[PDB]
Coordinates of C-alpha atoms and ligand atoms in Angstrom, one line a residue:
Chain A
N628 CA -35.2 -34.8 19.8
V629 CA -33.3 -32.8 22.4
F630 CA -29.6 -32.2 22.8
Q631 CA -28.1 -30.1 25.5
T632 CA -25.1 -28.0 24.4
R633 CA -22.6 -25.6 25.7
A634 CA -24.3 -22.8 23.8
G635 CA -27.9 -23.6 24.7
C636 CA -30.7 -26.0 24.3
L637 CA -30.7 -27.4 20.8
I638 CA -33.9 -29.0 19.6
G639 CA -34.3 -31.0 16.4
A640 CA -30.8 -32.1 15.5
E641 CA -29.4 -35.5 16.5
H642 CA -25.9 -35.3 18.0
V643 CA -22.9 -36.9 16.3
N644 CA -19.4 -37.7 17.7
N645 CA -17.8 -37.6 14.3
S646 CA -16.4 -34.2 13.7
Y647 CA -16.3 -32.6 10.4
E648 CA -15.2 -29.2 9.1
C649 CA -17.5 -26.4 10.2
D650 CA -20.6 -25.7 8.2
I651 CA -23.1 -23.5 10.0
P652 CA -21.5 -22.0 13.1
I653 CA -23.6 -22.0 16.3
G654 CA -21.4 -21.4 19.3
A655 CA -18.7 -23.0 21.5
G656 CA -17.4 -24.8 18.5
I657 CA -20.7 -26.6 17.6
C658 CA -21.3 -26.6 13.8
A659 CA -24.4 -28.0 12.2
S660 CA -24.7 -29.4 8.7
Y661 CA -27.6 -31.0 6.9
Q662 CA -26.5 -34.4 5.6
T663 CA -27.0 -37.7 7.3
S676 CA -32.9 -40.1 5.0
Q677 CA -31.0 -37.0 5.9
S678 CA -31.6 -34.9 9.0
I679 CA -29.9 -31.9 10.5
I680 CA -27.1 -32.9 12.7
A681 CA -24.9 -31.0 15.2
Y682 CA -21.3 -31.9 16.2
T683 CA -18.2 -30.4 17.8
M684 CA -16.5 -28.3 15.2
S685 CA -13.5 -30.0 13.9
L686 CA -10.6 -27.7 13.2
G687 CA -9.1 -28.4 9.8
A688 CA -7.7 -31.8 9.0
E689 CA -5.0 -33.2 11.3
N690 CA -1.4 -33.5 10.1
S691 CA 1.8 -34.4 11.8
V692 CA 4.8 -33.4 9.8
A693 CA 7.4 -36.1 9.7
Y694 CA 10.4 -34.3 11.1
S695 CA 14.0 -35.0 11.9
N696 CA 17.1 -32.9 12.2
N697 CA 18.5 -34.2 8.9
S698 CA 15.2 -34.3 7.1
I699 CA 14.4 -31.7 4.4
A700 CA 11.5 -31.6 1.9
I701 CA 12.1 -29.7 -1.4
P702 CA 9.2 -29.2 -3.8
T703 CA 10.2 -30.6 -7.3
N704 CA 7.0 -29.2 -9.0
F705 CA 4.8 -26.1 -8.8
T706 CA 1.3 -24.8 -9.7
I707 CA 0.2 -21.3 -10.6
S708 CA -3.1 -20.4 -9.0
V709 CA -5.2 -17.3 -9.7
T710 CA -7.2 -16.3 -6.7
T711 CA -9.9 -13.6 -6.9
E712 CA -9.8 -11.1 -4.0
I713 CA -12.7 -8.8 -3.6
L714 CA -12.8 -5.4 -1.8
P715 CA -15.2 -2.6 -1.4
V716 CA -13.8 0.8 -2.5
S717 CA -16.6 3.3 -2.5
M718 CA -20.2 3.3 -1.2
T719 CA -23.2 4.9 -2.8
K720 CA -23.0 8.6 -2.4
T721 CA -26.1 9.9 -0.7
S722 CA -27.2 13.4 0.3
Chain B
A929 CA -23.3 -15.7 -6.4
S930 CA -21.8 -15.6 -2.9
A931 CA -18.2 -14.7 -3.9
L932 CA -19.3 -11.0 -4.3
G933 CA -21.0 -10.9 -0.9
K934 CA -18.5 -8.3 0.3
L935 CA -19.7 -5.9 -2.3
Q936 CA -23.3 -7.2 -2.1
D937 CA -23.3 -6.6 1.6
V938 CA -22.2 -3.0 1.2
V939 CA -24.8 -2.2 -1.4
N940 CA -27.5 -3.9 0.7
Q941 CA -26.7 -2.2 4.0
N942 CA -26.8 1.2 2.2
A943 CA -30.2 0.4 0.6
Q944 CA -31.1 -1.2 4.0
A945 CA -30.8 1.9 6.2
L946 CA -32.4 4.0 3.5
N947 CA -35.5 1.8 3.7
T948 CA -35.4 2.0 7.5
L949 CA -34.8 5.8 7.3
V950 CA -37.9 6.0 5.0
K951 CA -40.1 3.8 7.1
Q952 CA -39.3 6.1 10.0
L953 CA -41.4 8.7 8.3
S954 CA -44.5 6.5 8.9
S955 CA -44.0 6.1 12.6
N956 CA -46.1 8.1 15.1
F957 CA -43.2 8.7 17.6
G958 CA -46.0 9.5 20.1
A959 CA -47.6 12.1 17.8
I960 CA -51.2 11.6 16.8
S961 CA -50.3 10.7 13.2
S962 CA -47.3 10.3 10.9
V963 CA -48.7 12.6 8.2
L964 CA -47.3 16.0 9.0
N965 CA -50.4 17.7 7.6
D966 CA -53.0 15.7 9.5
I967 CA -51.7 17.1 12.8
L968 CA -52.1 20.5 11.2
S969 CA -55.5 19.6 9.7
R970 CA -57.2 18.2 12.8
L971 CA -55.7 20.3 15.6
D972 CA -55.5 24.0 16.1
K973 CA -51.8 25.0 16.0
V974 CA -51.4 26.0 19.7
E975 CA -51.5 22.3 20.6
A976 CA -50.2 20.9 17.2
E977 CA -46.9 22.5 18.0
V978 CA -46.3 20.0 20.8
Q979 CA -47.3 17.2 18.5
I980 CA -45.0 18.1 15.7
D981 CA -42.2 18.2 18.2
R982 CA -42.6 14.4 18.8
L983 CA -42.5 14.0 15.0
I984 CA -39.5 16.3 14.6
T985 CA -37.7 15.1 17.7
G986 CA -38.3 11.6 16.5
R987 CA -37.4 12.2 12.9
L988 CA -34.6 14.6 13.6
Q989 CA -33.1 12.0 15.9
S990 CA -33.8 9.3 13.3
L991 CA -31.5 11.2 10.9
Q992 CA -28.6 11.4 13.4
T993 CA -29.0 7.6 13.8
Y994 CA -28.8 7.2 10.0
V995 CA -26.0 9.8 9.6
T996 CA -23.9 8.3 12.4
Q997 CA -24.3 4.8 10.8
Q998 CA -23.0 6.2 7.5
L999 CA -20.1 7.9 9.2
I1000 CA -19.1 4.7 11.0
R1001 CA -19.8 2.5 7.9
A1002 CA -17.9 4.9 5.7
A1003 CA -15.0 4.8 8.1
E1004 CA -14.9 1.0 7.5
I1005 CA -14.9 1.5 3.7
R1006 CA -12.3 4.2 4.2
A1007 CA -10.2 1.5 5.8
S1008 CA -11.0 -1.0 3.1
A1009 CA -10.2 1.6 0.4
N1010 CA -6.7 2.0 1.8
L1011 CA -6.3 -1.7 1.8
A1012 CA -7.1 -1.7 -1.9
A1013 CA -4.9 1.3 -2.6
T1014 CA -2.2 -0.5 -0.7
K1015 CA -2.6 -3.7 -2.8
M1016 CA -3.1 -1.7 -6.0
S1017 CA 0.2 0.1 -5.3
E1018 CA 2.2 -2.8 -3.9
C1019 CA 0.6 -5.9 -5.4
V1020 CA -0.4 -4.8 -8.9
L1021 CA 2.1 -2.0 -9.5
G1022 CA 5.0 -3.8 -7.8
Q1023 CA 5.6 -7.3 -6.6
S1024 CA 4.8 -8.0 -2.9
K1025 CA 7.2 -9.6 -0.5
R1026 CA 4.5 -9.6 2.2
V1027 CA 3.5 -13.1 2.8
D1028 CA -0.3 -13.7 2.2
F1029 CA -1.0 -10.0 1.8
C1030 CA -1.7 -10.7 -1.9
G1031 CA -3.3 -14.0 -1.2
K1032 CA -2.0 -17.5 -0.4
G1033 CA 1.3 -18.4 -2.0
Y1034 CA 4.3 -16.7 -3.3
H1035 CA 3.0 -13.7 -5.3
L1036 CA 3.9 -13.1 -8.9
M1037 CA 1.5 -10.4 -10.2
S1038 CA -2.0 -9.0 -9.8
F1039 CA -4.6 -8.0 -12.2
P1040 CA -7.1 -5.3 -11.0
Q1041 CA -10.7 -5.7 -12.2
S1042 CA -13.5 -3.2 -11.5
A1043 CA -16.7 -4.2 -9.8
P1044 CA -19.6 -2.0 -8.8
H1045 CA -18.5 0.2 -5.9
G1046 CA -15.6 -2.1 -5.4
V1047 CA -12.5 -3.7 -7.0
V1048 CA -11.5 -7.2 -7.7
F1049 CA -7.9 -8.4 -7.9
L1050 CA -6.7 -11.5 -9.7
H1051 CA -3.6 -12.6 -7.9
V1052 CA -1.3 -14.8 -9.9
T1053 CA 0.6 -16.8 -7.3
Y1054 CA 3.2 -19.5 -7.2
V1055 CA 2.3 -22.5 -5.1
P1056 CA 4.8 -25.5 -5.0
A1057 CA 3.5 -29.0 -5.4
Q1058 CA 5.4 -32.2 -5.3
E1059 CA 7.9 -33.0 -2.5
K1060 CA 10.7 -35.5 -2.0
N1061 CA 12.2 -36.7 1.3
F1062 CA 15.8 -35.6 1.2
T1063 CA 18.6 -36.1 3.7
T1064 CA 20.2 -32.7 4.2
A1065 CA 23.3 -31.2 5.8
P1066 CA 23.9 -27.6 6.8
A1067 CA 27.6 -27.7 5.7
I1068 CA 30.2 -29.9 4.0
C1069 CA 33.7 -30.5 5.2
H1070 CA 36.1 -30.7 2.3
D1071 CA 39.7 -30.3 3.4
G1072 CA 38.6 -29.5 7.0
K1073 CA 37.3 -26.2 5.8
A1074 CA 33.6 -25.9 5.8
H1075 CA 31.5 -25.1 2.7
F1076 CA 28.2 -23.5 3.0
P1077 CA 25.6 -23.1 0.2
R1078 CA 25.9 -19.6 -1.2
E1079 CA 22.1 -19.6 -2.0
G1080 CA 19.8 -22.5 -1.2
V1081 CA 20.9 -25.6 0.6
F1082 CA 22.7 -28.9 0.4
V1083 CA 20.7 -32.0 -0.1
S1084 CA 21.6 -35.6 -0.9
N1085 CA 19.4 -38.0 -3.0
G1086 CA 21.9 -40.9 -2.2
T1087 CA 25.7 -40.3 -1.9
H1088 CA 26.0 -37.3 -4.2
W1089 CA 25.5 -34.1 -2.0
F1090 CA 23.5 -31.6 -4.2
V1091 CA 23.3 -27.9 -3.6
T1092 CA 20.0 -26.5 -4.9
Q1093 CA 17.7 -23.6 -4.7
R1094 CA 15.2 -23.6 -1.9
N1095 CA 11.7 -23.4 -3.5
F1096 CA 12.3 -25.6 -6.5
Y1097 CA 14.3 -28.8 -7.0
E1098 CA 17.1 -28.3 -9.4
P1099 CA 20.0 -30.5 -8.2
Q1100 CA 23.5 -29.2 -9.1
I1101 CA 26.9 -30.7 -8.6
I1102 CA 28.7 -28.9 -5.8
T1103 CA 31.5 -26.6 -6.8
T1104 CA 33.2 -23.8 -5.0
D1105 CA 31.2 -21.3 -7.1
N1106 CA 28.2 -22.7 -5.2
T1107 CA 29.7 -22.4 -1.8
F1108 CA 31.7 -20.0 0.3
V1109 CA 34.1 -21.2 2.9
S1110 CA 33.9 -20.3 6.6
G1111 CA 35.6 -21.3 9.8
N1112 CA 36.4 -25.0 9.9
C1113 CA 34.8 -28.3 10.7
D1114 CA 34.9 -28.9 14.4
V1115 CA 32.2 -26.3 15.2
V1116 CA 29.3 -26.7 12.7
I1117 CA 26.8 -29.2 14.0
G1118 CA 25.9 -32.0 11.6
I1119 CA 28.4 -31.1 9.0
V1120 CA 29.1 -34.1 6.7
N1121 CA 31.9 -35.3 4.5
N1122 CA 32.1 -34.9 0.8
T1123 CA 34.4 -33.6 -2.0
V1124 CA 33.5 -30.2 -3.4
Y1125 CA 34.4 -30.3 -7.0
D1126 CA 36.6 -27.6 -8.4
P1127 CA 35.8 -25.8 -11.6
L1128 CA 39.4 -24.7 -12.0
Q1129 CA 41.3 -27.9 -11.2
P1130 CA 40.3 -29.8 -14.4
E1131 CA 40.9 -26.8 -16.6
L1132 CA 44.5 -27.0 -15.5
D1133 CA 46.0 -30.2 -16.4
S1134 CA 46.7 -29.2 -20.0
Chain C
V723 CA -29.4 -6.9 23.9
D724 CA -33.2 -7.5 23.9
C725 CA -34.5 -4.1 23.0
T726 CA -38.2 -4.7 23.8
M727 CA -37.4 -6.2 27.2
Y728 CA -34.6 -3.9 28.2
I729 CA -36.8 -0.9 27.5
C730 CA -40.1 -2.3 28.6
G731 CA -39.8 -4.9 31.4
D732 CA -42.8 -7.3 31.6
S733 CA -45.3 -4.6 30.5
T734 CA -47.4 -4.7 27.5
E735 CA -48.4 -1.1 28.3
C736 CA -44.9 0.0 27.7
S737 CA -44.4 -2.6 25.0
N738 CA -47.2 -1.2 22.9
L739 CA -45.8 2.3 23.1
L740 CA -42.5 1.1 21.8
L741 CA -44.2 0.1 18.6
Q742 CA -44.8 3.8 17.9
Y743 CA -41.0 4.3 17.6
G744 CA -41.0 1.8 14.8
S745 CA -37.8 0.0 13.8
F746 CA -35.5 1.3 16.5
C747 CA -36.0 -1.9 18.5
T748 CA -35.2 -4.1 15.5
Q749 CA -32.4 -2.0 13.9
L750 CA -30.5 -2.2 17.2
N751 CA -30.4 -6.0 17.0
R752 CA -29.4 -5.6 13.4
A753 CA -26.6 -3.3 14.6
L754 CA -25.3 -5.5 17.4
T755 CA -25.5 -8.6 15.3
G756 CA -23.3 -7.0 12.8
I757 CA -20.8 -6.6 15.6
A758 CA -21.4 -10.0 17.1
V759 CA -21.0 -11.7 13.7
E760 CA -17.7 -10.1 12.7
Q761 CA -16.2 -10.8 16.1
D762 CA -16.1 -14.4 15.2
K763 CA -14.9 -13.3 11.8
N764 CA -12.0 -11.5 13.4
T765 CA -11.0 -14.5 15.5
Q766 CA -11.4 -16.5 12.3
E767 CA -9.1 -14.3 10.2
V768 CA -6.4 -14.0 12.8
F769 CA -6.0 -17.5 14.2
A770 CA -7.0 -19.9 11.4
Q771 CA -5.0 -19.0 8.4
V772 CA -3.7 -22.6 8.2
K773 CA -5.3 -25.3 6.2
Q774 CA -4.4 -28.2 8.5
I775 CA -3.8 -28.7 12.2
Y776 CA -0.1 -29.6 12.5
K777 CA 1.2 -31.1 15.7
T778 CA 4.8 -31.1 17.0
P779 CA 6.7 -34.3 16.6
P780 CA 6.8 -36.6 19.7
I781 CA 10.5 -35.9 20.5
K782 CA 12.0 -32.4 20.7
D783 CA 15.4 -31.9 19.3
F784 CA 15.6 -28.3 17.9
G785 CA 19.4 -27.9 18.3
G786 CA 19.2 -26.6 21.8
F787 CA 16.0 -24.4 21.6
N788 CA 13.7 -25.5 24.5
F789 CA 10.2 -24.8 23.3
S790 CA 8.5 -26.6 26.2
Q791 CA 7.7 -23.1 27.4
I792 CA 5.7 -22.2 24.4
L793 CA 4.4 -25.5 23.1
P794 CA 1.1 -27.0 24.3
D795 CA 1.4 -28.6 27.7
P796 CA 0.5 -32.3 27.3
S797 CA -0.4 -32.6 30.9
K798 CA -3.0 -30.0 31.1
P799 CA -6.7 -31.0 30.6
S800 CA -7.1 -28.1 28.3
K801 CA -3.8 -28.2 26.5
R802 CA -2.3 -24.7 26.6
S803 CA 1.4 -23.8 26.6
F804 CA 2.9 -23.0 30.0
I805 CA 3.0 -19.3 29.1
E806 CA -0.7 -19.1 28.1
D807 CA -1.7 -20.0 31.6
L808 CA 0.2 -17.0 33.0
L809 CA -2.0 -14.9 30.7
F810 CA -5.4 -16.4 31.5
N811 CA -4.7 -15.8 35.2
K812 CA -3.9 -12.1 34.7
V813 CA -7.0 -11.3 32.6
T814 CA -10.4 -11.8 34.2
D835 CA -21.7 -10.4 39.6
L836 CA -21.7 -9.4 35.9
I837 CA -22.4 -13.1 35.3
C838 CA -26.3 -12.9 35.5
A839 CA -27.1 -9.3 36.6
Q840 CA -26.7 -8.0 33.0
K841 CA -28.5 -11.2 32.0
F842 CA -31.5 -10.1 34.1
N843 CA -32.6 -7.3 31.8
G844 CA -31.9 -8.8 28.4
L845 CA -28.2 -8.1 28.3
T846 CA -26.8 -11.4 27.0
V847 CA -23.2 -12.5 26.5
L848 CA -23.2 -15.0 23.6
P849 CA -20.4 -17.6 23.6
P850 CA -17.6 -16.9 21.2
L851 CA -17.9 -19.4 18.3
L852 CA -14.4 -20.8 19.0
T853 CA -13.8 -22.2 22.4
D854 CA -10.5 -21.3 24.1
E855 CA -9.3 -24.9 23.7
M856 CA -9.8 -24.5 20.0
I857 CA -7.9 -21.2 19.9
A858 CA -5.1 -23.1 21.6
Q859 CA -5.1 -25.7 18.8
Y860 CA -4.7 -23.1 16.1
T861 CA -1.9 -21.4 18.0
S862 CA -0.5 -24.9 18.4
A863 CA -0.7 -25.6 14.7
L864 CA 0.7 -22.2 13.6
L865 CA 3.4 -22.8 16.2
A866 CA 3.9 -26.4 15.2
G867 CA 4.4 -25.6 11.5
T868 CA 6.5 -22.6 12.2
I869 CA 9.0 -24.8 14.2
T870 CA 9.1 -27.8 11.9
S871 CA 8.2 -26.5 8.5
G872 CA 9.7 -23.1 8.4
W873 CA 7.6 -20.5 6.6
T874 CA 6.5 -22.7 3.8
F875 CA 3.3 -23.9 5.4
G876 CA 1.7 -20.6 4.8
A877 CA 2.4 -20.9 1.1
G878 CA 1.2 -24.5 0.7
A879 CA 1.9 -27.9 2.0
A880 CA 4.2 -27.7 4.9
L881 CA 7.8 -28.8 4.2
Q882 CA 9.8 -30.4 7.1
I883 CA 13.1 -28.6 7.4
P884 CA 15.7 -28.9 10.1
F885 CA 15.1 -26.1 12.5
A886 CA 18.7 -25.2 12.7
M887 CA 18.6 -25.0 8.9
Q888 CA 15.6 -22.8 9.2
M889 CA 17.4 -20.2 11.2
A890 CA 20.2 -20.1 8.6
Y891 CA 17.6 -18.7 6.2
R892 CA 16.1 -16.2 8.7
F893 CA 19.6 -14.8 9.1
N894 CA 19.9 -14.5 5.4
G895 CA 16.6 -12.6 5.6
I896 CA 18.2 -10.0 7.8
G897 CA 21.5 -9.9 6.0
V898 CA 23.6 -11.9 8.5
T899 CA 25.3 -14.7 6.5
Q900 CA 24.3 -18.1 7.7
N901 CA 27.9 -19.0 8.6
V902 CA 27.2 -17.0 11.8
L903 CA 24.5 -19.4 13.1
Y904 CA 26.3 -22.7 12.2
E905 CA 29.2 -21.4 14.3
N906 CA 27.3 -19.6 17.1
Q907 CA 24.5 -22.1 17.3
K908 CA 25.2 -23.2 20.9
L909 CA 25.4 -19.6 22.1
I910 CA 22.3 -18.6 20.2
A911 CA 20.6 -21.5 21.8
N912 CA 21.2 -20.2 25.3
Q913 CA 20.4 -16.6 24.5
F914 CA 17.1 -17.8 23.1
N915 CA 16.2 -20.0 26.1
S916 CA 17.3 -17.5 28.7
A917 CA 15.2 -15.0 26.7
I918 CA 12.1 -17.2 26.9
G919 CA 12.5 -17.6 30.6
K920 CA 12.3 -13.9 31.3
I921 CA 9.1 -13.7 29.3
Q922 CA 7.5 -15.7 32.1
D923 CA 8.5 -13.2 34.8
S924 CA 7.8 -10.2 32.5
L925 CA 4.3 -11.5 32.6
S926 CA 4.4 -13.2 36.0
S927 CA 5.7 -10.3 38.1
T928 CA 3.8 -7.4 36.4
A929 CA 0.0 -7.2 35.7
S930 CA 0.2 -4.1 33.5
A931 CA 1.6 -5.8 30.4
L932 CA -1.8 -7.1 29.5
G933 CA -3.5 -3.7 30.0
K934 CA -4.4 -3.6 26.3
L935 CA -6.5 -6.7 26.7
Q936 CA -7.5 -5.7 30.2
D937 CA -8.7 -2.3 29.0
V938 CA -10.9 -3.9 26.3
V939 CA -12.6 -6.3 28.8
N940 CA -13.1 -3.5 31.3
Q941 CA -14.6 -1.0 28.8
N942 CA -17.1 -3.7 27.7
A943 CA -18.1 -4.5 31.2
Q944 CA -17.9 -0.8 31.9
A945 CA -20.6 0.3 29.5
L946 CA -22.8 -2.6 30.5
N947 CA -22.8 -1.4 34.0
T948 CA -23.6 2.1 32.8
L949 CA -26.2 0.7 30.5
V950 CA -27.8 -1.2 33.4
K951 CA -27.6 1.8 35.8
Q952 CA -29.5 3.8 33.2
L953 CA -32.5 1.6 34.1
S954 CA -32.6 3.2 37.6
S955 CA -32.7 6.8 36.4
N956 CA -35.9 8.8 36.4
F957 CA -35.3 10.6 33.1
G958 CA -37.9 13.0 34.3
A959 CA -40.5 10.4 34.9
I960 CA -41.9 10.0 38.4
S961 CA -40.0 6.7 39.0
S962 CA -37.6 4.3 37.4
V963 CA -39.7 1.2 38.1
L964 CA -41.9 0.8 35.0
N965 CA -44.7 -0.7 37.0
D966 CA -44.9 2.0 39.6
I967 CA -45.9 4.5 37.0
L968 CA -48.5 2.1 36.0
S969 CA -49.7 1.2 39.6
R970 CA -49.5 4.9 40.9
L971 CA -51.1 6.7 37.9
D972 CA -54.2 6.1 35.6
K973 CA -52.8 5.1 32.2
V974 CA -53.9 8.2 30.2
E975 CA -51.3 10.4 32.1
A976 CA -48.9 7.5 32.7
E977 CA -48.5 7.3 28.9
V978 CA -46.7 10.6 28.9
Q979 CA -44.6 9.5 31.8
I980 CA -43.5 6.2 30.2
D981 CA -42.4 8.2 27.2
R982 CA -39.7 9.9 29.3
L983 CA -38.6 6.5 30.4
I984 CA -38.7 5.0 26.9
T985 CA -37.3 8.1 25.2
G986 CA -34.6 8.1 27.9
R987 CA -33.9 4.4 27.8
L988 CA -34.3 4.0 24.1
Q989 CA -31.9 6.8 23.6
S990 CA -29.6 5.2 26.2
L991 CA -29.4 2.1 24.1
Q992 CA -28.4 4.1 21.0
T993 CA -25.6 5.6 23.1
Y994 CA -24.5 2.1 24.1
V995 CA -24.9 0.7 20.6
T996 CA -23.0 3.5 19.0
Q997 CA -20.2 3.1 21.4
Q998 CA -19.9 -0.6 20.6
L999 CA -19.9 0.1 16.9
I1000 CA -17.2 2.7 17.3
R1001 CA -15.3 0.5 19.7
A1002 CA -15.6 -2.6 17.5
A1003 CA -14.3 -0.6 14.6
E1004 CA -11.2 -0.1 16.6
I1005 CA -10.9 -3.8 17.4
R1006 CA -11.7 -4.5 13.7
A1007 CA -8.6 -2.4 13.0
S1008 CA -6.6 -4.1 15.6
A1009 CA -7.7 -7.5 14.4
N1010 CA -6.3 -6.8 10.9
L1011 CA -3.1 -5.7 12.5
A1012 CA -2.9 -9.1 14.1
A1013 CA -3.9 -10.9 11.0
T1014 CA -1.3 -8.9 9.2
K1015 CA 1.4 -9.8 11.7
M1016 CA 0.2 -13.4 12.0
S1017 CA 0.5 -13.7 8.2
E1018 CA 3.6 -11.7 7.6
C1019 CA 5.5 -12.1 10.9
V1020 CA 4.6 -15.6 12.1
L1021 CA 4.0 -17.3 8.8
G1022 CA 6.7 -15.5 6.9
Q1023 CA 9.7 -13.3 7.9
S1024 CA 9.0 -9.6 7.9
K1025 CA 11.3 -7.1 6.2
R1026 CA 9.3 -4.2 7.6
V1027 CA 11.4 -2.4 10.1
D1028 CA 9.9 -2.4 13.6
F1029 CA 6.6 -3.8 12.4
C1030 CA 7.4 -7.0 14.4
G1031 CA 9.0 -5.1 17.2
Ligands
NAG1201 C1 -17.3 -41.0 14.9 O1 -16.0 -41.5 15.2 C2 -15.9 -42.6 16.1 C3 -14.4 -42.9 16.2 O2 -13.7 -41.8 16.8 C4 -16.7 -43.8 15.8 O3 -16.7 -44.7 16.9 C5 -18.1 -43.4 15.4 O4 -18.8 -44.5 14.8 C6 -18.2 -42.2 14.5 N1 -19.6 -41.7 14.3 C7 -20.4 -42.2 13.4 C8 -20.1 -42.0 12.0 O5 -21.4 -42.8 13.8
NAG1202 C1 8.7 -38.8 4.2 O1 8.6 -40.1 4.7 C2 7.6 -40.2 5.8 C3 7.6 -41.6 6.3 O2 8.8 -41.9 6.9 C4 6.2 -39.8 5.3 O3 5.3 -39.8 6.3 C5 6.3 -38.4 4.7 O4 5.0 -38.0 4.2 C6 7.4 -38.3 3.6 N1 7.5 -36.9 3.1 C7 7.8 -36.6 1.9 C8 8.2 -35.2 1.7 O5 7.7 -37.4 1.0
NAG1203 C1 11.5 -27.2 28.3 O1 11.7 -26.5 29.6 C2 10.9 -27.1 30.7 C3 11.0 -26.1 31.8 O2 10.1 -26.5 32.9 C4 11.5 -28.4 31.0 O3 10.8 -29.0 32.1 C5 11.3 -29.3 29.8 O4 11.8 -30.6 30.0 C6 12.1 -28.6 28.6 N1 12.4 -29.5 27.5 C7 11.6 -29.6 26.4 C8 10.8 -30.8 26.4 O5 11.7 -28.9 25.4
NAG1204 C1 5.3 -31.1 -12.8 O1 4.5 -32.2 -13.1 C2 3.1 -32.1 -12.8 C3 2.4 -33.4 -13.1 O2 2.6 -33.8 -14.4 C4 2.5 -30.9 -13.6 O3 1.2 -30.7 -13.2 C5 3.3 -29.7 -13.4 O4 2.7 -28.6 -14.1 C6 4.8 -29.9 -13.7 N1 5.7 -28.8 -13.3 C7 7.0 -28.9 -13.8 C8 8.0 -28.7 -12.7 O5 7.3 -29.1 -14.9

């Protein structure tokens, strides 16, 4: 199976309209993922999940609840000292 | 096992170039062999001099490649180290007001944890959850004076205008100790009617 | 860059010699890929910090703040705010020439139309939701009641805005207008970008022109040395080409590494501003200007 792209000539993955969050980046916003049996697909990378905030000049939204999340953040500090 | 990739990538790239740097010893570089002694064993020196050049020139260059990589790569780590030392100072030791510098959400505290040739922070952050649609007003006319929230904002579940803090919902009856007066009504856009209760007035009547 | 081709064009004779320098050819690709990868990491860190794509409400009432300048233009085929078009015209053959010898320009993972959706989202949430969308679910708040906070941030009590709103509206709008001409009437504002693009296209030209240099060899055409010299001597000649060219890559590669490390630093500066300045409100004096 052959599918022409913006990035290049992509062989072996059936096209899909239906755009999902990116999985394996390729180029020009074409992200391939494995699932449907299953076959490698390729599709236009969808950016996030759409939202439209209901907005009006008198409308405010105050959170009444909270959560406390602990998020690991990882950094290099030193590298192996070689001479 | 992919969370530590940042560290894992650093360690690999170091061990990577070393392998490459070693494998460069086995390359001919145009010389007759990669064993420095074989050129000396087979050939009389007069000529073997020119051969060993191609080894040296090749290898000696191949170091500068490796060295330059390390310099460049260290300069990245040197930048990442400051980012840590910045977080360690601001995030761990203090409390950071920099949005999403300590990680998504309002930041409470951070816990450093060591990791090989690296560091790992546990950022304890405050993320709000459940919302309600409120009708709001920027100000409240009382007598024709305007009352603005001292801290937080006015909101109204139904008729009762509630002043409350911004990032958590704790409705409070509106009293002059919640609001400072400014100007008067005809200016502020969207000001609404209400009665701002007085702490003092009830205390009086006796 | 294709190391084997760029060095040895269409010649196994040269191609075999290259094997005697070992992993140079491969480690260059390993080098440039490291750059090429993180470029789409930079653009990833900067633009997409937001979980969802917000979009402006259908009707614009901000209290007098015209954002039609900066908001996506619904009538363009690629939706990009009126301003952004001023930019894409200023910034700018090299199209296939480089691509002759194995110098390839890979497409950036994110198309410009996507970049304009992020900068729509970030700008859509900033307007409607205040700064809270960076800390979690966006919270609709009246824009005029947003600016009451952002004054409290700088120490000006909010009663200034609720009274001066109309005035502040005009000062804002009339300020946005001049941003057009600031860009429209002068092409040097974008020099920072323009310098980056040039220096890249610069070294590529230089890298190409190095193909035409003798480097001590009898000619710069790899085949002429083969068609005008029995191989046994031509071996030594092609060395001076290879040694010259192969070096000339490491020069180019090292430049890119160094230059990318600058961009990598500039990218974080953006991602820092984007997070702190756009998504929040900055207390850092003259960090946001
Ligand atoms: C993708 O989405 C379109 C609707 O936008 C729909 O017509 C199509 O069936 C979808 N693709 C799939 C899942 O086949
Ligand atoms: C407010 O109501 C609208 C519907 O009018 C809804 O789309 C929105 O999600 C609601 N928001 C909150 C904060 O409940
Ligand atoms: C924003 O300004 C433009 C200037 O061309 C104007 O045409 C547009 O109607 C304005 N209003 C909005 C939609 O904000
Ligand atoms: C609010 O309620 C939710 C659901 O029960 C709970 O997860 C959260 O921890 C509570 N926080 C508060 C405000 O007590």
